């Protein structure tokens with residue numbers, strides 16, 4: 001058992017509705033107004049082909065930028081300097097207002113929600129996960145603190161060999177609805193998390209998407225709100241965004257916090273703007289000045305043993321769901337597979353959003369090219 | 385085999401991507417920008433509880449209208465007189481701009497798309513279905529004309545006992561993704577349609593949702609466009625709608641034409657406005673004056689043997705995916721289970737939209753109450 005979870009709608013029974021009951025009362029009143037949450041759906045455009053390149057200023061300093069963006073399968077690219085959009089690019093077939101999957105950049109958004117609750121005193125990072133989710137007792141999350149989840153410093157037996165159906169990464173997807181279910185799989189994401197084990201050691205960084213979903217679960221237990229709603233109330237609704245964001249949900253309606261959020265490039269930039277504004281957004285304060293300061297400061301360097309990151313950023317680290325380069329510019333970034341970045345350049349008070357679709361989720365090749373672009377663009381914003 | 389179908393994206397292989405391949409190239413470029421079409425997803429509101437009742441004028445003539453709307457589980461109600469919104473109502477929890485499932489009102493939209501193609505001369509209603517979908521040879525659709533599909537005058541062995549998994553109505557849902565698949569079920573909607581049989585007789589009305597999906601299939605074969613896109617190009621994109629509409633899609637990306645469209649009440653009214661404007665919309669002509677005239681004229685009365693309809697509307701009929709009351713006002717309406725109506729009142733140049741969630745899909749009780757409201761509101765618009 002995974003305990004109490006926020007009802008899909010007021011008064012809903014546990015797990016209701018399902019794909020086989022949404023047409024029945026009392027579920028249908030809610031379902032008829034939110035069918036996309038139950039059945040895959042397509043948009044029928046209200047609007048009646050070519051790449052849009054408005055690199056403006058930085059174009060002079062980076063003449064071959066558009067070609068570099070194409071080479072890195074860029075779908076949407078946007079540079080926000082201060083409160084102004086100084087550069088934009090969208091591939092042919094992708095409109096400026098189209099939404100794009102954020103993959104793990106979603107984690108940085110989740111960490112932000114957790115930070116908001118810490119600022120309210122509803123979550124104490126020093127407390128064990130079990131203080132908020134008792135049902136995680138007996139799992140690898142029995143013992144570690146919420147901060148250790150936030151910094152991903154928990155050793156977990158997490159097979160990353162996706163090709164293997166028995167692997168935790170593929171099992172995670174099947175439990176959440178990102179892949180076809182197999183007989184015996186956990187019923188939902190909550191159940192999947194309870195099956196995770198580890199040797200008990202903590203302190204060393206181990207990137208694991210399950211950590212973010214545990215954070216979302218904690219958010220639900222502390223607020224009583226579905227993660228989908230908490231993400232809106234504590235973050236999205238305060239950004240004065242152009243469009244709603246979306247997030248995939250599993251069979252119980254639990255949002256895939258670790259990587260299922262989609263939004264426009266311009267709106268994602270609003271998240272970066274909030275971070276560079278000390279945690280304040282147009283709709284009010286999202287997180288405390290201290291929270292933002294700690295994110296920019298970085299995590300323990302000694303905990304960061306991922307050569308894939310440190311070979312490029314030797315003094316890099318990770319904290320509160322953000323990757324910290326530790327470079328001379330103090331760059332910090334939300335990162336997602338296939339080329340997604342919510343890159344912060346505090347030196348120039350700028351935010352760089354790059355949403356892509358590399359053929360591969362991760363290769364040294366793509367990252368070298370991607371980081372080269374982000375660093376070059378950041379430097380092009382420097383006063384000269 | 386069901387033959388050629390519009391690719392999910394340019395150059396896509398048949399049936400690609402699937403829930404298990406969308407993260408792979410070359411599918412991911414498209415999938416990352418349209419994930420809702422693959423995995424159930426929820427909206428994360430950009431906006432930070434009580435029913436909204438603005439019945440205005442008709443309120444004086446119908447004092448207990450709000451109570452009547454509540455009694456019929458009304459979610460959204462809107463009256464458009466001419467080009468003006470003269471009355472509105474939205475239940476607590478449903479915003480004016482929220483979208484609502486249309487159920488079979490979706491059929492009237494599909495019929496409109498077919499009409500647009502008839503006006504272009506790309507579809508001849510007198511031609512047999514097999515002229516456009518040869519793969520339907522050997523099925524109940526082998527012999528009947530496209531017009532007979534439009535008017536639903538084809539005898540089909542269609543078990544309406546949903547509770548029975550072997551029934552065609554439940555099988556239709558499972559084949560399209562509206563319900564959980566069972567071993568042995570057709571792979572997609574196209575395949576399901578090819579399994580349908582009948583005694584060969586035609587001429588008598590038999591309401592069958594499979595007919596509308598055959599129309600959508602014909603639309604795809606004649607245009608080369610996914611039904612989702614054809615619905616936009618030939619109808620939605622010409623309405624100057626406030627929001628995109630949505631439509632559930634099966635595993636191949638085929639829109640559930642018979643009942644999976646969702647849209648706002650105000651935008652649905654734009655469809656009615658187009659009909660009362662002789663087939664013309666703000667973005668251009670949608671269907672011919674003749675098509676609209678034939679819809680308002682009604683179908684053969686003798687073909688209409690559904691007592692559920694004729695007990696209320698003795699001179700009623702059905703044609704081109706619209707229900708024609710044949711009453712003294714010449715009312716015609718798109719109708720969907722659980723209380724959905726796109727009601728046309730040509731006498732007052734008005735359109736009445738009522739989107740609801742009755743606990744039951746259909747009962748004489750609900751229809752009596754629902755029609756009573758639509759007729760009373762129509763009469764309240766008469767000059768006095």
Ligand SMILES: NCCCCCC(=O)O
Nearest residue numbers: 103104173258259336337
């Ligand atoms: N297994 C779902 C993928 C989650 C995204 C992971 C990442 O972007 O690093």
Ligand SMILES: NCCCCCC(=O)O
Nearest residue numbers: 487488557642643720721
């Ligand atoms: N089997 C899917 C339901 C389709 C709606 C039918 C109707 O509204 O009459």
